[PDB]
Amino acid sequence: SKVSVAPLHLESAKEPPLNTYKPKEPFTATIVSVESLVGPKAPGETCHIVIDHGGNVPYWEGQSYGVIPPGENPKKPGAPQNVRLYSIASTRYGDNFDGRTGSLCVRRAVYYDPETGKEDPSKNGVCSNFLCNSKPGDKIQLTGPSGKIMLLPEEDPNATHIMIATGTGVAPFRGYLRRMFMEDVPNYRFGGLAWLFLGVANSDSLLYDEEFTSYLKQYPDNFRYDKALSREQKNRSGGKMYVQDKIEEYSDEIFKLLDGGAHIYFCGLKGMMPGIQDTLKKVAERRGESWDQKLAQLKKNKQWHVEVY
Ligand SMILES: Cc1cc2nc3c(=O)[nH]c(=O)nc-3n(C[C@H](O)[C@H](O)[C@H](O)COP(=O)(O)OP(=O)(O)OC[C@H]3O[C@@H](n4cnc5c(N)ncnc54)[C@H](O)[C@@H]3O)c2cc1C
């Protein structure tokens, strides 16, 4: 049974909001909560941040918020810090189902000397640590929203959406899937196939796993979910198990879905992409197809959606 969301006037806009707040005059939002998403064996912390924007900074699923961390820009004296962008991990209604909050999925960027292993906090990532160090009531300078690459194509409510994430790249897909399955959105009744592939380092590094597993039990004919755990699993050619390796386990199903018009999405750190391309090229070759020609047609058909960073 789908969760009631409000206010339904968030469905009325026909275009996504863009640059509602700009860096020189951000919106001062308020932290609701910060929690770690990961267990003790995870190589680093990733946190879920809930931000009260008061309904002043609405967005569509797949967009990003900008955050301006405090302090001076180290490269421009007297100037504010540069915006850092974060894929929004919530639906437009947010985790409180009220249209007032949005959420981020933030990996702490921590510096370690490559030899001594000693941490150096002075070289840690500024905005990511600022966010994961935040507490209820803290203020955040919010900009945006921005981005259109990862908007969800809703013209066909029975479309197929193949979602390929590593790490924090799961963020837009958390939003897609809540809109598809969790929330009572009368004007978007999804009856297609949503297929999430997620690569992380180990079980303790999984993000939102209980939520995704719940969809398998609630929507077994509309949702599929496959995981790759790089430090705990090995591919058939015995490298570490990466998200491209799990795609290959479903080579024929995936290529048939693409040929049938499926959308495919990639999100996360950009290092995930060269290997995914290598696997797709090899899968195509085994089928007697040219991956170059296939990718050109997927791009021409607007089926190929990549936001990596
Ligand atoms: C569209 C988009 C969406 C994104 N979505 C997400 C998301 O959902 N989640 C997420 O976590 N990130 C996301 N990012 C990345 C995010 O914008 C930031 O780049 C990231 O959080 C790091 O920012 P920071 O301020 O913490 O690090 P910065 O302060 O910008 O530092 C960058 C890196 O340099 C390192 N560093 C700094 N000084 C030194 C030094 N002297 N020597 C060596 N190393 C040094 C830091 O440790 C860090 O790793 C996204 C990016 C884009 C473009």
CB 222 within 8 A of CB 191: yes
CA 185 from centroid of its chain's CA atoms: 21
Contacts of 280 (CB under 8 A, 6+ apart): 244, 247, 291, 294, 295
Phi and psi torsions of 33, nearest 5°: -160, 155
Q: Which two tokens stand for residue 278?
A: 């290598």
Looking at the domain assignment, is residue 194 inside a domain? Answer: yes
Round to whole Å and give the CA distance between 92 and 122: 36
**Same domain for 218 and 103:** no
Contact 300, 259 (CB under 8 A): no
Compute φ and ψ for 105, nearest 5 degrees: -120, 105
- Domain with 178 in it: 147-308
What are the residue numbers of the active site? 86-87, 267, 307, 309
From residue 278, give the alpha-carbon distance in Å to each of 214, 285, 306. Answer: 32, 11, 16
Domain of 40: which CATH number? 2.40.30.10
The string of DSSP letters for 221-290 reads TTEEEEEEETTT-B-TTSSB--HHHHHHHTHHHHHHHHHTT-EEEEEE-GGGHHHHHHHHHHHHHHTT--
Side chain identity at residue 5, one-letter code: V
User: Same domain, yes or no, for 78 and 124?
Assistant: yes
Residue 233 and residue 121 share a domain = no
Resolution (A): 1.1
Q: Determine if the peptide bond prior to 114 is cis (ω within 30°).
A: no
Residues 166 and 295 in one domain: yes
Residues followed by a break in the chain (C to N exceeding 2.5 Å) are none
Residues 176 and 283 in one domain: yes
Measured from the CB, is residue 141 less than 6 Å from ligand 1?
Answer: no
* Cβ neighbourhood burial of 20 (10 Å; 0-12, 13-18, 19+): middle
Q: Are residues 164 and 283 in the same domain?
A: yes
Residue 228 lies in a domain: yes
Q: Is residue 27 part of a domain?
A: yes
List of residues 6+ apart from 231 with CB closer than 8 A: 43, 201, 202, 240
Domain boundary among 109, 131, 146: 146
Residue 130 sits in the same domain as residue 268: no
Which residues share a beta bridge with 112?
A: 119
Q: How far apart are CA 87 and CA 307, in angstroms?
A: 9
Domain for residue 131, yes or no?
A: yes
DSSP designation for 182: I
Indicate the annotated binding residues for FAD.
84-87, 105, 107, 123, 126-128
Looking at 146, 177, 205, which one is the last position of a domain? 146
> What phi and psi, each to the nearest 5 degrees, are found at residue 5?
-125, 150
Beta bridge partners, 162, equal: 195, 264
State the Cα–Cα distance between residues 171 and 150, nearest whole angstrom: 11
Query: Which residue in this structure is represented by tokens 């001594």?
Result: 116
The structure's method of determination equals X-ray
R_g of the chain, CA atoms, integer Å: 20
- Number of neighbouring beta carbons within 10 Å of residue 12: 8
Q: Residue 275 domain-assigned?
A: yes
Ligand 1 pocket member 127 (CB < 6 A): yes
Instruction: Let me know whether 12 and 49 are in one domain.
Output: yes
Instruction: Using alpha carbons, select from 98, 97, 66 the residue that is nearest to residue 82.
Output: 66
Q: How many domains does the chain have?
A: 2
For residue 153, say if its preceding peptide bond is cis, omega within 30 degrees of 0. no
Instruction: Decide: 305 in ligand 1 pocket, CB within 6 A.
Output: no
CATH number of the domain within which 200 lies: 3.40.50.80
Which of 126, 120, 82, 121 lies closest to 106, judged by CA?
126
The answer to whether residues 151 and 130 belong to one domain is no
> Distance between terminal CA atoms of the chain?
36
* Pocket test residue of 48, 51, 64, 84 for ligand 1, highest count of atoms within 8 A of CB: 84
Candidates 204, 196, 209, 184; CA nearest to 265 is 196
Cross-sheet strand order for the sheet of 263-268: 223-229, 193-200, 160-166, 263-268, 304-308
Which residue is it, tokens 């509309």?
222
Considering Cα of 97, then 100, then 105, then 108, what sign does the dihedral take? negative
Place of tokens 């640059």: 19
Closest to 60 measured CA to CA, from 12, 1, 21? 12
170 and 290 in a single domain? The answer is: yes
Contact 267, 169 (CB under 8 A): yes
User: Could you identify the atom of ligand 1 that is nearest to the CA of residue 107?
Assistant: 11
Query: Are 31 and 108 in the same domain?
Result: yes
Out of 146, 166, 183, a domain closes at: 146
Count of other CB atoms within 10 angstroms of residue 226: 14
Q: Both 84 and 220 in a single domain?
A: no
63 lines ligand 1 (CB under 6 A): no
Contact residues for 197 (Cβ-Cβ < 8 A; gap 6+): 162, 163, 164, 165, 226, 227, 228, 243, 246, 247
Backbone angles phi, psi at 40, to 5 degrees: -65, -20
What is the 129 CA–ligand 1 centroid distance (Å)? 10
Asked, for residue 282, whether it belongs to a domain, the answer is yes
Q: Is residue 2 part of a domain?
A: no
Residue 1, domain member (yes or no): no
